[PDB]
Amino acid sequence: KGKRVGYWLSEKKIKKLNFQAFAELCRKRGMEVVQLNLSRPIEEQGPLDVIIHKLTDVILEADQNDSQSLELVHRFQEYIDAHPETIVLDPLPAIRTLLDRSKSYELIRKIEAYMEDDRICSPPFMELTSLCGDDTMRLLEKNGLTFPFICKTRVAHGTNSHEMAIVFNQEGLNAIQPPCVVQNFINHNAVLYKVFVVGESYTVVQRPSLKNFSAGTSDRESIFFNSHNVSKPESVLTELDKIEGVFERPSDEVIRELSRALRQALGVSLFGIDIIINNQTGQHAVIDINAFPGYEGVSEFFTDLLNHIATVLQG
């Protein structure tokens, strides 16, 4: 009781999360919950014990030299600075890394090489700004990529944030849309583990996923898909032909500690990780990472989130 929560979320995000029902829940626990108007001064709307937000679009527009958004981001960052006792779910530098796939994957790569756990090794990736003619694949190869590989948007947010294409041969290269991030497709017996993290708690949801494909080049057209759509509990795309190689459940110890290093490196708390078991190596691989996802499905979300807010206020 008497705790004030300020939030800022787009109409669309509010709707996906059923966030107003969540706000009212908080109110019944004695909290005050206010929708922050970032165009007015934030003191006037204070004091604030917690701010929960997803300011991604504003962050993107500010980088694009948008006057409005630049001002919004400044006033918000300034208020945060002036009030280090306000808990921000989640810090602005965390959003900025997670919105950009070449940054987030580089983070994962450094975290893995930090963790010194042989149980975890994610696929090679690169930022491919442009095709370099007939020799494009020699560029990918220089960077440890070959067919089949999976090009994704650099920005992990927006309309086409999860629109993707898997490419199997030279003739299929016309499917790439640069600039983009390319990442080797790793066979994993068509099972994805979606990990939804809400602070210290996490839920591992097993989901469908793309099937196994032969190594190197295949004589087959590039496949356009949406990663969110494919992996709904929800194609011939996701029907495993046969089990090959390593086919095991993921380790809760690897998932915990991955979650923890992420939260520590970034001060992030609301995010999801997509994990597969590489069927060659048996290692866990992070194939994507999403700031503040829809938590679509997900059992006990409101509880976990209320628990998380109470926990950080406890610190």
Description:
Keywords: Acetylation, ATP-binding, Hydrolase, Isomerase, Kinase, Magnesium, Metal-binding, Nucleotide-binding, Phosphoprotein, Transferase. 1D-myo-inositol 1,3,4-trisphosphate binds at residues 13, 162, 194, 290. By secondary structure, the protein is α/β, with parallel strands linked by helices. The protein has two domains: 1-90 and 295-315, Rossmann fold; 91-294, ATP-grasp fold, B domain (D-amino Acid Aminotransferase, Chain A, domain 1, 2-Layer Sandwich), CATH 3.30.470. 33% of the residues lie in helices and 22% in strands. It is built from ten helices and 13 strands. It has helices at residues 11-17, 19-28, 56-63, 67-82, 92-98, 101-115, 136-142, 227-230, 252-266, 301-314; strands at 4-8, 32-35, 50-53, 87-89, 125-128, 149-151, 163-167, 180-183, 191-198, 201-208, 223-226, 270-277, 284-291. Strands 2-1-3-4 form a four-stranded parallel sheet, covered by helices on one side. The chain starts with a strand and ends with a helix. 31% of the residues are buried.
